Amino acid sequence: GSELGFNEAERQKILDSNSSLMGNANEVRDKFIQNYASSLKDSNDPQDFLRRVQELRINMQKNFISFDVYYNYLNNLVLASYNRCKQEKTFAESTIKNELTLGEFVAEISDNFNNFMCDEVARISDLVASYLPREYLPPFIDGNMMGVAFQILGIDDFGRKLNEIVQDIGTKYIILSKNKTYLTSLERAKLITQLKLNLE
Amino acid sequence: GSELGFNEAERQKILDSNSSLMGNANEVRDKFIQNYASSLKDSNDPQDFLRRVQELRINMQKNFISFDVYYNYLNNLVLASYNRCKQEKTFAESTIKNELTLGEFVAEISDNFNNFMCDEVARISDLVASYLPREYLPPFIDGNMMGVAFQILGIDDFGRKLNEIVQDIGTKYIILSKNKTYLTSLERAKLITQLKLNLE
């Protein structure tokens, strides 16, 4: 079982193989936001703010900034991650005869799949949300300007796409882990008894 | 610009940079179909054919065959192709002030984007549809068995995803080509007159 557990070397291979797509997204975001977004603070009024946000969106495009590459990158990661973990799990199931040892490998493979994917999703999601930079918001900023600004910048749409990836990661993790994080109904009924919880 | 026109080398780099996912896909298909699908021809009734199709689906997954990988590959291609062609087009528009020369470069870039993407989509689409192998249908195959089999094998669902990719390619080609393939209303009314077409 030397090479199993979706270890750091295997996770680094997948990150390396998709590293080109990202470039230095953080550097690109920081350079872009410094150059094009500061004027948002001086918006004369609500209408003017939204107008400046649309201009910021047009400037993102002119700078080849699109969240489509970030969504593809995450899709690439889930597929390669799931593929490797599924190979490791099935290989472990065919070769490991110690049933407790097998369960430990299954838990480690699936845990590392789950945390690998969730951490990259969080990193990409934070990057995307930061294209509405809070330090440059105007002092009269309210919730409806913020919402519409999220829509204009494509951040709202990216958030919807995240639902699909998160749901997909969730199903794949449920498969890889055989759901062992969560109790059976009988195990749960017994723990509620032992814990002396009175529910409802 | 000696490097403009989305040339063979630029297309080849995108193919090379993405062919890791599509390693020997045609050979994977041919060996899988050879080794697992031939018994479809000996199906005994429509309901037995569909149960064998469901087993074929199960064996696809056991053999790590997933159309999700092919859909990701096409998304990777569209985004890399569009990025490169957008880079070339914007460069040509800022450096080539002869309108005739520029229009020729714009048409070549966008034509090559369109044919490159359409050719790859057709290659993937044919591959996916070939997982319902013609050489092995039972002699009583009808349209309803065929339709359900396309659904069971994931081929129908892939066809739906192709709608999204084809639409995206279409919009991107309209942007890259400036729609110059198609006539203006006035040019069209003129050509209809000149051709003495009497329509309706």
Add this chain to the structure above:
Amino acid sequence: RFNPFAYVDFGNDVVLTEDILSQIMVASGGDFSTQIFGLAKLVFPERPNEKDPFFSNQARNLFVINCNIYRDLMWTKKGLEFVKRKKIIMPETPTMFFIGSMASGINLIDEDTNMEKVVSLMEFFGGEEDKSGDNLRVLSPATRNMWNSFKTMGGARETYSSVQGVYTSAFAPY
């Protein structure tokens, strides 16, 4: 008096860029690709409960294909020259009735009898009636792409008439 195709942009009449398109029964969209896939989903909605989603999916594809065939023949120079030469009969503005009728194929004046006939898409575009390949070549790359996929899926020998049946029934109100 309403015709959804009156609001579909078939030609090159408005400047369409990234800038303009990102700000952007009648389908939404600024470009023909977006508009026509949107209209196809209005004509062939997705119903979650399925009695043959494949046939309905493939009929929606055939709708997009027919609309693209109309655009390629009637809104390009080489298309309109081809329509003149082959004596193809198509309207100046498409209607739901006309697009519905394309299920049967291309209306043209026969070369020998000089009478109007209909040639199926399968024969006319890349088939028995197109052995020089001249007809298929007039179509754009996207139209040829979708037609290739369709012949491989809904256009298969066993499924075709059932797809045409599902297609035709959405045009009954015309």
Add this chain to the structure above:
Amino acid sequence: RFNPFAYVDFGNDVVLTEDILSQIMVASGGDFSTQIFGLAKLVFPERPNEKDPFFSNQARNLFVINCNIYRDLMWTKKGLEFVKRKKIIMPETPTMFFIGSMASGINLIDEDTNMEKVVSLMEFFGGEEDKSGDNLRVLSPATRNMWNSFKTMGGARETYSSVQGVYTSAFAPYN
């Protein structure tokens, strides 16, 4: 008497494999992730010509977050020990009324006054009532992931109340 959560599989009762899953107001799906995002779409449908889609998209995310918080607290061993320890009040089977009520936060017994109180999610999970960080750590990776995304978007200071309003609106049939 109909409860859609009665048809959501919170626990580990069904054998779920790729093979089984390939064959597949109640949401369809054989696994918790599919079912809960499906149910979120029934409660917060995607309206075609909807005004401000951001608030409803983020209210829909909040629904998924609240349901995952319930599952992590009530359907894991360490979650149930945390619920006992913290004197958190949650039902044995969630209801639409209860999930709507999580918009205000976590119901628990105040240790000082021994009276029931509500602590906002923002304070309770990673917030000022969780400087320890232990509350956030009892949640699963997906729940923390979604909760992180939410705080950068719908839960931002300007929009949170609007999102909560849209969220609570969907539960008007139940209050």
